[PDB]
Structure 1
């Protein structure tokens, strides 16, 4: 079995921009202010028209006024402007609001909407769970008096995903989102997301790539070249999966018969028996080390512990966050809440078990589904049927939630806030519709 090298490079997009001049001045705009990927489009189309990495650069060019090539895949057109590109969206929520105004101005150019006053269409907004009130007042300002929108509603994107795959709007189910930055589990009763009962995990996927960067830097402190963070996401999306059970795998993960198929080695770009030594197997894998070869100094022997970086979702204690994992949150929700006791499930809990939806940008990792169903049947009573659902693209389904609420008109009128209600009630006002945030108090 000869060693194969793996290259870590990402090429550039030669065709960044496209738009259509014709538009409907009555059809609203569906938007998704995603951390990893901004998604845009109309109402009538089933899939989102514009997907963009939600990033901008202020490219400075001498003799031509130093303000060029702001938002989109044109940042991915050159590696230099890709490196200087600044996503404004911070940990909780975005820091730089006029940067967001640049993004909204760019996409309003890219729907081809000819401007009538500020904006002649309703705007369909996505919003993270349990938003800080100052953040929503800034949202109210930037929408209503900066862009003159007739109507804006905002809610939790995974709740819209839950509505999208169960469009009756009154089903009982459990939704577990794994987003870019945080991940959370929300219980839903009768189509209403009970937000007193939900719990949120401060890990996401940003900290997963950060963890992979830190482990790969500490494993090889004397690595010659430095490896880019985009290459870290390439390495994370390519070679990572979730164990069926973590506890018995890690004893077997450095056994010699395992390393033949487990270990895949990455090549960084450039231009005392070993069977007894477990450091040799950890650092250099199943082939003997060639200490003179310039390939081996640039060889990144990962997949010795490829399981460890996805597994920290189920156990955030390796991530440093003292929060219970997804399994314990499911135990508390399904066996201690909504009238269910250990040994006697209430009917709402059984209906929640019957419909479990997982979604988000971090669900693209293989092996999550079988681990989730096995962990669920670990603690549920025997005979309780468990049905867990996956998307083709779990990240793209919040936009279909936008399209679904845009279709359902009698539900759409309940969610939509108006300019008149905003000016009458002030920015400290949120409609307590079921598919969105609730009041801070009763």
Structure 2
């Protein structure tokens, strides 16, 4: 029996706000400007209090002649107001800036804050790796002029999750983050991220679901009903896994002994034998195809793509990116760098092996940890104890990162930038600390 997918259901209730009496001006504010979702709240709380995708609508009402503004979870109330959602992220950066100001105003309104002459709380901000000077300049402008905050500090979300899962701040490990739009590999030495050996592959969740979108467009060019981006996102989330060995799995997934079990049929919502032909297996699975059935031609068949699309991270040549794979880049980092002779692991490499951490938004795909453990056992010398740590939800460990950082006041003051330092040194200033970006030169 084929399954039918839809859009995710809209929220029946709107998002509540925190009580204004519980606000104190001494507590900092933790924000995570992710490419997919926004996480906002205090520091003393450990559990999340505000998670919503970054979107905004300008709903023009006919009767009142007033442009209403719906932010984040308020966009998940009607289908028309969901479809007109606009993200501020254009590419891997931000381009429109006033949208960032009104979503920050929405977070400040929904945090239960009654401020005066701007926000009196220092803020904790995550930023992408090798961030371009213009957006951090504009960030300094908006926080140091629009919101009057006393202090600011910055860092990478992957290193922040690494510091969260290694709270001593002096450990050695190798972090891997699979973000919404980029995949990063950072070798960490003694609690400090070695960013001169960091590596980035231009693929993420957004490129993967666009790969699903144009793969489904190419596979069924005569499909009548255009399905939205959310359907592609949901069936990528629910019906995709990392293959344990892509060379051996691809030579048997088209057999009839797998297509009875490993084929997912997805029904679109609306109101000379075929056994020996692999076109009929690839398009219509192991069940015979009747072109006169109305429910039949509204169907996807996910047989090869479920193991094909997570393999783009391991081999970027499928996705068109002329880059080395995650396993090959990790081999380059681990076997020929940090004083490690190929064939003779240094103690830095041995310490990096035992603290391999996978985080990010795109670690939810099953079979990733077992596959990277299999590859690591494949290329390392025999007898090396390989440890891979994976969170239950690796999309929230960054907020745990700034929570543990601002709870640790001893090392919190090493990374902060006040109004006074910015005012004396301008926007062009780099604060060289362990858990953030370094200087662009030597």
TM-score of the superposed pair, with normalisation by structure 2: 0.97
Residues 280/21 of structure 1: CA separation in 2 closer, same or farther (3 Å cut): farther
Residues 269/12 of structure 1: CA separation in 2 closer, same or farther (3 Å cut): farther
Deviation at 1:358, TM superposition (A): 0.5
Q: Deviations over 1:113-153 (max 9, x none)?
A: 11121110010001000001111111110111121111111
Deviation at 1:64, TM superposition (A): 2.0
Matching of residue 142 in structure 1 with residue 142 in structure 2: yes
Deviation at 1:13, TM superposition (A): 5.9
Q: Deviations over 1:65-85 (max 9, x none)?
A: 332142121101111111110
Residues 10/70 of structure 1: CA separation in 2 closer, same or farther (3 Å cut): closer
Contact 2:40 2:51 in 1 (8 A): yes
Corresponding residue number in structure 1 for 2:121: 121
* Structure 2 runs not aligned, ≥5 long: none
Residues 99/301 of structure 1: CA separation in 2 closer, same or farther (3 Å cut): same
Deviation at 1:34, TM superposition (A): 1.0
Deviation at 1:319, TM superposition (A): 0.7
Q: Distance in 1 between matches of 2:142 and 2:2?
A: 58
Residues 72/419 of structure 1: CA separation in 2 closer, same or farther (3 Å cut): same
Q: Deviations over 1:275-295 (max 9, x none)?
A: 111000000011111111111
Q: Deviations over 1:149-203 (max 9, x none)?
A: 1111111101000000000000000000001111110000000001111011111
Q: Which moved more, 1:61-70 or 1:316-325?
A: 61-70
Residues 3/185 of structure 1: CA separation in 2 closer, same or farther (3 Å cut): closer
Contact 1:19 1:110 in 2 (8 A): no
Residues 13/215 of structure 1: CA separation in 2 closer, same or farther (3 Å cut): farther
Corresponding residue number in structure 1 for 2:34: 34
SS in 1 for 2:309: helix
Residues 289/7 of structure 1: CA separation in 2 closer, same or farther (3 Å cut): farther
Q: Distance in 2 between matches of 1:18 and 1:274?
A: 61
Deviation at 1:370, TM superposition (A): 0.2
Residues 342/10 of structure 1: CA separation in 2 closer, same or farther (3 Å cut): farther
Contact 2:2 2:264 in 1 (8 A): no
Residues 236/17 of structure 1: CA separation in 2 closer, same or farther (3 Å cut): farther
Q: Deviations over 1:381-436 (max 9, x none)?
A: 00000000011110110000010111110100001001000010110002101000
Q: Deviations over 1:48-107 (max 9, x none)?
A: 210010111111111323321421211011111111100011212111111000010000
Residues 236/345 of structure 1: CA separation in 2 closer, same or farther (3 Å cut): same
* Structure 1 runs not aligned, ≥5 long: none
SS in 1 for 2:185: strand
Deviation at 1:352, TM superposition (A): 0.3
SS in 2 for 1:30: strand
Residues 52/28 of structure 1: CA separation in 2 closer, same or farther (3 Å cut): same
SS in 2 for 1:280: helix
SS in 1 for 2:295: helix
Q: Distance in 1 between matches of 2:422 and 2:383?
A: 50
Q: Distance in 2 between matches of 1:291 and 1:17?
A: 53
Matching of residue 251 in structure 1 with residue 251 in structure 2: yes
Matching of residue 280 in structure 1 with residue 280 in structure 2: yes
**If each structure's strand is expressed as a fraction of its own residues, which one has the higher value?**
2
Contact 2:3 2:267 in 1 (8 A): no
TM-score of the superposed pair, with normalisation by structure 1: 0.97
Contact 1:52 1:72 in 2 (8 A): yes
